Amino acid sequence: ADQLTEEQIAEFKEAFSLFDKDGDGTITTKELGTVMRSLGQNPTEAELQDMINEVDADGNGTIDFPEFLTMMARKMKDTDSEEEIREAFRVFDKDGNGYISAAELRHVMTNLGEKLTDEEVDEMIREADIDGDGQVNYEEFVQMMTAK
């Protein structure tokens, strides 16, 4: 049953109001960049324009609740998922060596208050290690996620 239910929309609606600090039911570039800044980032207006402009259907330069709702289900269509999958490697790969090492993966997890045991991280690398290079590359990372 892939039919969307009214109760499920309420579950993401509560989270939706947290990003829109204005309370006007719309997200403005100032509201997103201001909270995005907390993530220790410093993006430019032109960079955010392309991201928001792509999902802007009313051309109002803001994301309205229904525009947001479409993105949430868009995960099933996997339309932008390709962009997030390629972008996520950039955030997970802190060294930028093009390969993610074991020490690097624990760091991003720690900043989010998350932490597992070495055996858990050791086994995870063993299962994802397809080429056997000892490190995870873009090939293994994209291939690991394209599983049925």
Binding site: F19, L32, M36, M51, V55, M71, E83, I85, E87
Partner: peptide
């Protein structure tokens, strides 16, 4: 970011498949 918010779902349900 519009796409950044999309990632939350990938690390939520997608990370669950691990166990």
């Amino acid at each position: 970011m519009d796409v950044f918010m999309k990632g939350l779902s990938k690390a939520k349900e997608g990370v669950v498949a691990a166990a």
